[PDB]
Write a protein that binds this ligand. Structure first.
Ligand code: TW3
Ligand code: TW3
Ligand code: TW3
Lengths: 524, 522, 541
């Protein structure tokens, strides 16, 4: 009997309240800023570079992606802000590469396309990191990889940050070989002149498509006709960009792959409240606190939520819901973490792992302005319990940072270091080891005590002098754009699109089967 | 019948030749420089810090490691040069942490000890990278991990490089939890005051040992944690008692090492190792036969070459080190299609027979050949790159000379996850040689300017070349690569045999899995 | 480096103290009583029955077992006191059957022999339970089973307690078939006339050995055949060694007499092609540093007094070496690592009332032992509630369960020894009989029940008084006293170790001086089977 009636979460906010108006105004300003910056990034490398690229008879990378994917299918771009102000004087729109997940011939695939307009397609360190992240996502979710290779190889300056280390350029070929060995299809489309680094990519790909004249593969001489007829590196011969994309679609169709789901499914229903109210509900000030249940009610199917252990450790919210017919276990933050909250989270994570249910984390860690210590030693014994449970979980984990994320709370709530399938942040998020004010006080006290043992007086004025720069540095570093410029936290997302982004991410992540979970020693 | 006689590799070098004398002099100078720098690094954080540390009654980290391991057992320290001149004005001897592999109660274990004298044990980014590398080594080789925790947490400045990212501090706890779940024992000895980051380490460890007064886990103390909070698992009076308890705990692990590969009696090489100084020298332009190096590091100087006359620029064959079968793949010149194919065949054979692989890299500069139709090499170089990546046997890479371009990837570079990687003091690593890079930059700028209609000055090409050559030389230095956690540590060539034996003995703990290969272009 | 020195547990007790003398006297009296009762049980069914059995040319069952096993090898008999005063007027020495573990041709095997002198080998309910327990032990430890079949079938009276139910006689054949399917060898030696129930045993066995004249296998005896169909036939003609060997083909070997049958059984066991391999590491065995007989004085016979379990541990472990785990947290529970005869073991003992900290510490230790694949040994001495009426036991419930689950889900070999009281949920927590330990033993001074007699008496009086008060019936103060005296007596009689041993619970009683030897034999037997991985349920936390 699936007809039983069930109470629904969420409540209607007070639109007339001044707090709602102010929060809505701040969030709208942030979202407009994000949209305009994304537009400028989408503009590309530059006018002259784009003109030359079009004159050569090639298609712009975004046009290539648009023609490659199925008509009208949504595209989930990743890390649009990579390289945003990362380097002092060089502009690298989008990191020089484009990555995302789209549907090709009815199959979800990961697409990696080089933007030839940005430094002739040379690989900056951020470009390598972005490509490695995309490859890791594809390997974890068992998604076929499609490469639109048009690059000039590694950026000769800054070679030390791109060539030598483990997570440097060679890891690309390593991942390609491993994923090929694991039956994850690799398809390389040589849409332009490659280089020594670029040349290896088509060689390791299972199937190659090279354009007649623009495509040129040389290890350091290289052409479509030569590679197709004598060297044999090329697998398909394409007249131009459109023909290459058509051939790629055909090749993807001939993959003989069928997606099968392990989790149960139910008909999808929209949430009972508009998503745009999240602007007023959340606002842009981290000092104020908002109930995460509103956010949950505005992003779940039918606003139906089954809370688990509601009255025990109420600072943490856990329960079961469904997004687009997908069961999910939601773990959100409603305040400071305590021992009871950690135990409740561990219990919920164990339940979800046992039942093979995907997990969703909503992080809003709180500053220590309210509580200086609160005998945090008790928290250590139990915080670890969660950190381990989260790490050992094998179900798909998606983390969304809707507010502050500081200290060990970031690790506890499935931080970037614990390998979530996807990680997103809202435009108002802040991430750092601790808040700037708290950090400033710690540095002043340590220096004063050490100086006192040394016998050097520590000036009271000096403590104030140290505090002002530290607060500014922490604010600049914690910015969402600072974190997105580095490949951490994938990309920033408009709160109004949270439901769609989560649905797409879970649909992509459900491709891989769910394995059994093995836990370590649970310190009692 | 194992009595059959077999020819032995190697030949006696000409000591009287001036080239041998010059090479020996250069290598001796390099080794002396390395030894003195290692001594200074071993000195520690500083005199005042060491005096304060001894005052508080604690033991110095090297003394802790010496007392922990079995008496007289060798210790294989890793990445001794981490943080060497990495930061502009701050000195971080050894990266602030000590990692290595030693035998505790007859069991090989990975030991990670914080040096409290360096910035009070605060974690620099290089410290986090070094600890992560040690944890990865232990996980790959299934070695128990022992932590001598004495740290002040993450360095508050430079927090962005230590806290947030995947390979940042949280990966430590992630690896700890995973290795605990995989039955790899975790033991934490709280030998001093920890912090927020330090506190989590003992919590996630299977067994904890905390000193009575120096140990403080946060408010936090040995008595409190042992009696009321229950975080501590053992109570130790002082450092010596804690080390004794750690030895007992390791003894109670119920673990027995079993080998899959066959073993034979060990025999010493037929030639002295110190002749490698004269044979190799310090000049990368000159070429030396890798067969000499092989003959001076294998048991009895016995080598069975495979495909000797096909692709002679690459040397492959079978030998034994300390009774351990090994497949040696060395460089004798520029890589060609035949060399790539031969290497792929040998790697397939070794993977099929479950034999550990050893790579000796000496990639050559392009001064001799500008292009040589390198397009042919691309089709076949990738076949070797894949074969190397897909291999599941233990792989150890040693860089005895230059390592440039895709040759680094082909010969099991750092990006392809070898179990261990070492470099000799005369090695050079970079994307390409400085001279070659200088020419490429000048040509690209001139051609782009010509299309633009801007004349590119001939003097400008010379102006660009001199700085590029200097930058490439400084970046390629072995100490530059060792300061970053790449290439573990530098090793004296005279100790290559011992280092390889220890590394293979450690790596043989884990069982050898089956190898699955991907699509092959051929 | 295994040469490192290690502190040793245990201390020298004060022999001159009067408490030691009194405890020693009480324990010596108990042990002497146990020894004399065991001697009387070993005497057998009776003089006339033994005389008839010998006159028929057969060997007594104990002689059969002695000749079967390897010369000089120790024999670990199980449940010697089964059926001791179980039935009102019928005496069933040893339950009518003999079970134990011994070495045959260098292989540890489980031996089940029927005592024909007791009721002509008829199966009492206790006999069926004992045989089922032996079969379960053999299946768990993967030990070959040897049956010396000489029985008259199910006891016709009391048939309802032997035939119908799941744990009744048919479970014997079920276990035989399952163990045969799992490559655990089954060998049946028909040493005497069987019956309908007895006949099926040789049929299901992989190999049969039947004596020439004494052995007779008939699916229905002559009297049974006459009752069922009115047919007259001699016992030998209906079922005999020659007939079964030559025409019916049920018999696999033909034996002239008992000695020949035992020799053939030894040969058959030799041709099993089995080699024992150990998974756990081994070390040279060393004797404990203190005499075992001091346990008499240390423990005594009074459960009210408390003794340190560390003494018992120090007197039964190799070299008296013990590595305590979490010594100062939850000190009422003792946990640590030691070695018995070179075998690693995790010891979990009781030193007082169980608390939340003790339960958490036990759960942690059990998880560690399961992860490292180390056998577990439980020493139970649960305490009465005279000291603490409630102590907010609600806190204990939240954490006691965690231990109960951890213990249940463990897959390592578990051996439980009850050295004192075992009451309430503490019995379940410390690997009670319901949680399937490989072996369970009790000392002669142990007491087991749901709660102590005094505590139970108070509970019954209060419940009746409150219910009567709501009813409006006055509950007499004298009535409360009247209810208390019988309850205390019933609890004392039921809790007796002999009461529990008469039923097949707790296997057998063991002299404390032989605890080390018994544990060594039990662990050596249990190490035959490989150690599987352990999967845990939800750890409520
Ligand atoms: C993997 C391993 C193991 C090793 C290797 O991979 S070693 C790879 C060596 N690379 C090459 O061998 C490619 C050399 N390029 C060329 O042959 C072409 O240039 C193309 C193919 C790039 C097409 O580009 P193009 O020629 O059509 O146009 P262009 O405007 O000239 O393109 C931008 C201009 O390139 C300059 N530029 C700066 N850095 C680089 C760089 N690293 N690579 C290429 N170009 C770069 C840029 O600064 C200037 O513009 P700017 O900055 O002055 O405005
Ligand atoms: C994981 C997550 C998620 C979060 C975290 O982990 S947030 C961790 C916050 N850290 C603390 O809360 C520890 C604060 N220390 C202390 O409480 C003590 O100091 C000890 C414990 C360190 C012992 O050291 P000590 O007190 O015995 O000696 P001292 O000489 O004072 O030791 C050197 C002096 O420490 C200065 N110093 C600089 N940077 C740091 C730093 N990051 N931590 C500590 N000290 C630092 C150094 O500059 C000066 O010496 P110098 O450079 O001036 O010569
Ligand atoms: C499995 C399923 C599904 C079904 C079945 O199994 S249905 C099995 C039906 N059983 C028989 O068909 C065997 C009938 N016995 C006989 O044919 C023989 O007796 C032998 C073979 C038992 C040898 O014994 P024996 O003949 O050499 O000596 P005896 O002294 O006579 O032996 C003791 C005397 O047996 C009396 N006695 C009481 N109860 C029984 C009992 N249940 N079975 C046998 N005897 C019993 C005892 O009371 C008296 O002695 P007591 O108590 O008076 O002192």
């Amino acid at each position: 009997y699936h007809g039983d009636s069930v109470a629904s979460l969420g409540t209607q906010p007070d639109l007339g309240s001044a707090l709602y108006q102010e929060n809505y105004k701040q969030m709208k300003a942030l979202v407009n800023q994000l949209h305009e910056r994304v537009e400028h990034i989408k503009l590309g490398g530059g006018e002259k570079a784009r003109a030359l690229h079009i004159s050569r008879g090639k298609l712009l990378p975004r046009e290539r992606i648009d023609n490659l994917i199925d008509p009208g299918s949504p595209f989930l771009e990743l890390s649009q802000f990579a390289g945003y102000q990362l380097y002092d004087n060089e502009e690298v729109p989008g990191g020089g590469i484009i990555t995302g997940i789209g549907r090709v011939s009815g199959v979800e695939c990961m697409i990696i396309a080089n933007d030839a307009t940005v430094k002739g397609g040379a690989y900056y360190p951020v470009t390598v990191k972005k490509q490695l992240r995309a490859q890791e996502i594809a390997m974890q979710n068992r998604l076929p990889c499609i490469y639109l290779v048009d690059s000039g190889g590694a950026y000769l300056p800054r070679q030390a940050d791109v060539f030598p280390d483990r997570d440097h350029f060679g890891r690309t070929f390593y991942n390609q070989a491993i994923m090929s060995s694991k039956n994850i299809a690799q398809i390389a489309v040589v849409m332009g002149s490659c280089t020594a680094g670029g040349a290896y990519v088509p060689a390791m790909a299972d199937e190659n498509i090279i354009v007649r004249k623009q495509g040129t593969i040389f290890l350091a001489l290289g052409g479509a006709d030569l590679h197709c007829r004598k060297s044999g590196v090329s697998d398909h011969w394409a007249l131009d960009d459109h023909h290459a994309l058509h051939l790629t679609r055909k090749v993807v169709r001939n993959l003989n792959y069928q997606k099968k789901l392990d989790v149960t499914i139910e008909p999808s229903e929209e949430p009972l409240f508009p998503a745009d109210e999240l602007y007023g509900i959340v606002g842009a000030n981290l000092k104020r606190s908002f109930d995460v249940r509103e956010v949950i009610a505005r992003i779940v199917d039918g606003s139906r939520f089954t809370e688990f252990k509601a009255f025990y450790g109420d600072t943490l919210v856990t329960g079961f819901a469904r997004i687009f017919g997908y069961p999910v276990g939601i773990v959100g933050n409603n305040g400071v973490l305590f021992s009871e909250s950690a135990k409740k989270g561990t219990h919920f994570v164990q339940l979800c792992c046992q039942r093979n249910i995907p997990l969703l984390f909503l992080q809003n860690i709180t500053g220590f302005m309210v509580g200086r210590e609160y005998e945090a030693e008790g928290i250590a014994k139990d915080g670890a319990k969660m950190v381990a449970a989260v790490a050992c979980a094998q179900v798909p984990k998606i983390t969304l940072i809707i507010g502050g994320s500081y200290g060990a709370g970031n690790y506890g709530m499935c931080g970037r270091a614990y390998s979530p399938r996807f990680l997103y942040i809202w435009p108002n998020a802040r991430i750092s080891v601790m808040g700037g004010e708290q950090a400033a006080n710690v540095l002043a006290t340590i220096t004063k005590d050490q100086r006192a043992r040394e016998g050097k007086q520590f000036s009271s004025a000096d403590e104030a002098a140290l505090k002002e720069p530290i607060i500014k540095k922490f604010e600049e570093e914690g910015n969402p754009y600072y974190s997105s410029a580095r490949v951490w936290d994938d990309g920033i997302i408009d709160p109004a699109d949270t439901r769609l982004v989560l649905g797409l991410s879970f649909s992509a992540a459900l491709n891989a089967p769910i394995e059994k979970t093995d836990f370590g020693i649970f310190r009692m």
